[PDB]
């Protein structure tokens, strides 16, 4: 008889069953328990400013071979240290150390992207200006 109760007065069993079984999809468990606000260096935010501690060359995952030119970044609102990827050939030269950058997610909603291991974020802005603008020479970085 399909397992579930079909009876006209079984709505309690049905809804308590749902309540207990919704804790098997990742999205529901995330929403309810709260993992953005506890874990997740961006506390449920889309972006986050951080101070560049270091530049890094991450060797890609197999079967590819390359060095991906990321940065170690300390966040301002948490103090969490975070690796973040600098796209768009060059732009590791346009960043420098102790620069203020703005980080965004690297696209895949938590989990990492492509051949870059451990990295979950990308750099969007440096010292108030966009890396895209600097790369296309629409603007120039403020030094002073």
């Amino acid at each position: 008889g399909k397992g579930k109760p079909r009876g006209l007065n079984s709505a309690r069993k049905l809804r308590v069953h749902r309540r207990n079984n919704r804790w098997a999809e990742n999205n529901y468990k995330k929403r309810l328990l709260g993992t953005a606000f506890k874990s997740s260096p961006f506390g449920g935010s889309s972006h986050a400013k951080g101070i560049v501690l270091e530049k890094l060359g991450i060797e890609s995952k197999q079967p590819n071979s390359a060095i991906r030119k990321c940065v170690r970044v300390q966040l301002i609102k948490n103090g969490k240290k975070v690796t973040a990827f600098v796209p768009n050939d060059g732009c590791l030269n346009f960043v420098d150390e102790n620069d203020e950058v703005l980080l965004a997610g690297f696209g895949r909603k938590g989990k990492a992207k492509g051949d870059i291991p451990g990295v979950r974020f990308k750099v969007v802005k440096v010292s108030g200006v966009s890396l895209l603008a600097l790369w296309k020479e629409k603007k120039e970085k403020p030094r002073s």
Binding site: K55, L56, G57, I67, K69, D89, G90, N93
Partner: protein, 60 residues
């Protein structure tokens, strides 16, 4: 995960490109006119072998 990677090689190809400059060309229309242009270029001119057409065919 990894410290070692010689960051000097950054910007290599974009620095090494044989910079070509953009050719100044006539102005393309914008909007209603462009749609007129495309309607012509689609339903007037081109087709290909026995059933087909291509919109950016390379020279052969």
């Amino acid at each position: 995960a990894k410290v070692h990677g010689s960051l000097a090689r950054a910007g290599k190809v974009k620095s090494q490109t044989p910079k070509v400059e953009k050719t100044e060309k006539p102005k393309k229309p914008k909007g209603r006119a462009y749609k007129r242009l495309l309607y012509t270029r689609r339903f007037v001119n081109v087709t290909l072998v026995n059933g087909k057409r291509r919109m950016n065919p390379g020279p052969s």
